[PDB]
Swiss-Prot record:
Organism: Aedes aegypti
Binding site for (9Z)-hexadecenoate: 15, 46
Reported function: Involved in modulation of blood-feeding behavior and capacity in female mosquitoes. Required for normal oviposition. Required for normal fecundity and fertility of female and male mosquitoes. Required for normal expression of VGA1 gene, which encodes the egg yolk protein vitellogenin-A1. Involved in regulation of spermatozoa development. Required for normal female longevity when mosquitoes are maintained on regular sugar meal. Binds long chain fatty acids. (Microbial infection) Facilitates shedding of dengue virus type 2 particles into mosquito saliva. Does not affect dengue virus type 2 replication or infection prevalence in midgut and salivary glands at 14 days after blood feeding.
Tissue specificity as recorded in UniProt: High-level expression in female mouth parts, particularly in the proboscis (at protein level). Moderate-level expression in female antenna (at protein level). Expressed in testis but not in the accessory gland or ejaculatory duct (at protein level). Expressed in spermathecae (at protein level). Female salivary gland. Female chemosensory organs: antenna, palp and proboscis. Not detected in midgut.
Protein name: Odorant-binding protein 22
Amino acid sequence: MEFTVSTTEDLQRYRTECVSSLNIPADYVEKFKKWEFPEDDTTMCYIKCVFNKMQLFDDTEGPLVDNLVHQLAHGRDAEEVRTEVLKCVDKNTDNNACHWAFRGFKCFQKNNLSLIKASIKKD
Ligand SMILES: CCCCC/C=C\C/C=C\C/C=C\C/C=C\CCCC(=O)O
């Protein structure tokens, strides 16, 4: 079972295809490059697509905890990472998948953004 962690280089690939597919305006893309994600439905579906191609989010189960700690805990205790992730894992009470994935991402980065940058970083 070969698991390929998504580095920054891989991330630039997935994110590009999601951009060209979801008709994401280049202006928004500039924001994303500076790690700026506006609270808007465009950005939300963008995050969903990216997180999906990275095999990190599913439209049914939501955030894939296993892959999440395997990815994020790049250089940190996976058990603690699992915990922090779970504190951002919720149910789709909003009933929109783009916003669901976006809420998980937004929740986590607001407390642990450095880990996100490090997870995709080749140490
Ligand atoms: C339930 C909480 C889940 C939190 C998951 C958060 C991040 C997923 C883990 C690793 C992803 C690391 C970097 C990718 C982050 C945003 C997608 C690219 C956005 C962009 O390129 O502009």
